[PDB]
């Protein structure tokens, strides 16, 4: 549990700021697509809960 | 419990004056799915 | 002897070891298969839809500047936009995952719009035998990465039998020249024709 | 590998108005060593 700790907070802190996002920078948005077709939401939940 | 003694070194890379960078952000996951086995394997999965 | 703009060629894999060519039908099925073609002595197999040009061929900041906007060689690094020559679309990577088992493996399929987010490649070598900058040779292993996915067209067994998906497994690809520019007045293979001296045609069990 | 390497520093700046000072500075260094290496390349195939 503590390793699946780092593995995520790692890609947390890689994820692109919020201001790029408002932006169109396509490479920027290329990652923000990966991270998050990598983890299903709702598995969070239930570790969240 | 070995391997966390790296990514604890990595999110020291990207991640600074509790702002992400750029640069090293952009580089380190384009190589970090060159070797899947890197993840954990109940996810690469339970 | 090189490879250039404008000219088909056959995507074809290899898996005993077995050459798979990568066709698609369009119009319908959207999606892409595969198709062997070691077995030819006893069943031809179809080429029809297996056919693809490469119209344009850039360099990766080349492309760049197209998006926020004439036989020229290509190179190791460039870019690549393959147009199906019969349904006369572009190849591209998908939306969604035709694997359903959590692989994050993307499905290969076609395209009708020429918008430039998923339909490009870039070709890399094989091993470090050649590099960046060096000429396409005829008949080398190549992997082929998205430019939108960052992921690797590849070959997959897991489910059963055999497909192509973009997922995050490199496998070596042969280019394997099918059609250079040919000459007028003259045939070539895959050349739609009829046969007159009166046509030769069958009945509308018509054998 | 200089010719590509100078193409693609083009391309960054093909969609740019202006120059700042610095993209010149890379760009002054950059064809300083070409007209020494054309120069260094001449001398090879001025004699006959």
Same mark, same amino acid.
């Given at each position: 549990?503590?390793?699946?700790?780092?593995? /995520?907070?790692?890609?947390?802190?890689?994820?692109?700021?919020?201001?790029? /996002?408002?932006?169109?920078?396509?490479?920027?948005?290329?990652?923000?697509?990966?991270?998050?077709?990598?983890?299903?939401?709702?598995?969070?939940?239930? /570790? /969240?809960? | 419990?070995?391997?966390?003694?790296?990514?604890?070194?990595?999110? &020291?890379?990207? &991640?600074?004056?509790?702002? $992400?960078?750029?640069?090293?952000?952009?580089?380190?996951?384009?190589?970090?799915?060159?070797?899947?086995?890197?993840?954990?394997?109940?996810?690469?999965? $339970? | 002897?090189?490879?250039?703009?404008?000219? !088909?060629?056959?995507?074809?894999?290899?898996?005993?070891?077995?050459?798979?060519?990568?066709?698609?039908?369009?119009?319908?099925?959207?999606?892409?298969?595969?198709? +062997?073609? @070691?077995?030819?002595?006893?069943? +031809? +197999?179809?080429?029809?839809?297996?056919? *693809?040009?490469?119209?344009?061929?850039?360099?990766?900041?080349?492309?760049?500047?197209?998006?926020?906007?004439?036989?020229? #060689?290509?190179?190791?690094?460039?870019?690549?936009?393959?147009?199906?020559?019969?349904?006369?679309?572009?190849? @591209?990577?998908?939306? #969604?995952?035709?694997?359903?088992?959590?692989?994050?493996?993307?499905?290969?399929?076609?395209?009708?719009?020429?918008?430039? !987010?998923?339909?490009?490649? #870039?070709?890399?070598?094989?091993?470090?035998?050649?590099?960046?900058?060096?000429?396409?040779?005829?008949?080398?292993?190549?992997?082929?990465?998205?430019? @939108?996915?960052?992921?690797?067209?590849?070959?997959?067994?897991?489910?059963? =039998?055999?497909?192509?998906?973009?997922? *995050?497994?490199?496998?070596?690809?042969?280019?394997? +020249?099918?059609?250079?520019?040919? =000459? !007028?007045?003259?045939?070539?293979?895959?050349?739609?024709?009829?046969?007159?001296?009166?046509?030769? #045609?069958?009945?509308?069990?018509?054998? | 590998?200089?010719?590509?390497?100078?193409? %693609?520093?083009?391309?960054?700046?093909?969609?740019? %108005?202006?120059?700042?000072?610095?993209?010149?500075?890379?760009?002054?260094?950059?064809?300083?060593?070409?007209?020494?290496?054309?120069?260094?390349?001449?001398?090879?195939?001025?004699?006959?």
């Amino acid at each position: 549990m503590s390793f699946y700790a780092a593995l /995520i907070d790692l890609l947390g802190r890689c994820a692109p700021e919020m201001h790029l /996002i408002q932006a169109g920078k396509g490479e920027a948005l290329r990652i923000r697509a990966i991270l998050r077709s990598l983890v299903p939401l709702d598995d969070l939940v239930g /570790i /969240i809960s | 419990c070995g391997g966390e003694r790296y990514l604890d070194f990595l999110r &020291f890379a990207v &991640f600074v004056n509790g702002e $992400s960078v750029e640069e090293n952000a952009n580089v380190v996951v384009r190589l970090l799915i060159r070797k899947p086995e890197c993840f954990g394997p109940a996810l690469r999965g $339970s | 002897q090189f490879l250039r703009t404008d000219d !088909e060629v056959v995507l074809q894999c290899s898996a005993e070891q077995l050459k798979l060519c990568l066709a698609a039908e369009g119009f319908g099925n959207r999606l892409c298969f595969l198709e +062997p073609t @070691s077995n030819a002595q006893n069943v +031809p +197999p179809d080429l029809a839809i297996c056919c *693809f040009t490469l119209e344009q061929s850039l360099s990766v900041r080349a492309l760049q500047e197209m998006l926020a906007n004439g036989h020229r #060689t290509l190179l190791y690094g460039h870019a690549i936009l393959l147009r199906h020559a019969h349904s006369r679309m572009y190849l @591209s990577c998908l939306t #969604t995952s035709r694997s359903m088992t959590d692989k994050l493996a993307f499905d290969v399929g076609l395209q009708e719009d020429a918008t430039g !987010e998923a339909c490009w490649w #870039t070709m890399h070598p094989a091993s470090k035998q050649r590099s960046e900058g060096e000429k396409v040779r005829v008949g080398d292993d190549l992997i082929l990465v998205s430019v @939108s996915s960052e992921r690797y067209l590849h070959l997959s067994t897991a489910s059963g =039998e055999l497909q192509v998906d973009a997922s *995050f497994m490199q496998t070596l690809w042969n280019m394997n +020249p099918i059609c250079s520019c040919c =000459e !007028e007045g003259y045939v070539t293979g895959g050349h739609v024709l009829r046969l007159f001296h009166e046509c030769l #045609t069958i009945s509308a069990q018509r054998r | 590998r200089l010719q590509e390497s100078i193409s %693609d520093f083009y391309w960054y700046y093909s969609g740019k %108005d202006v120059i700042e000072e610095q993209g010149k500075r890379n760009f002054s260094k950059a064809m300083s060593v070409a007209k020494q290496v054309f120069n260094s390349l001449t001398e090879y195939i001025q004699g006959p």
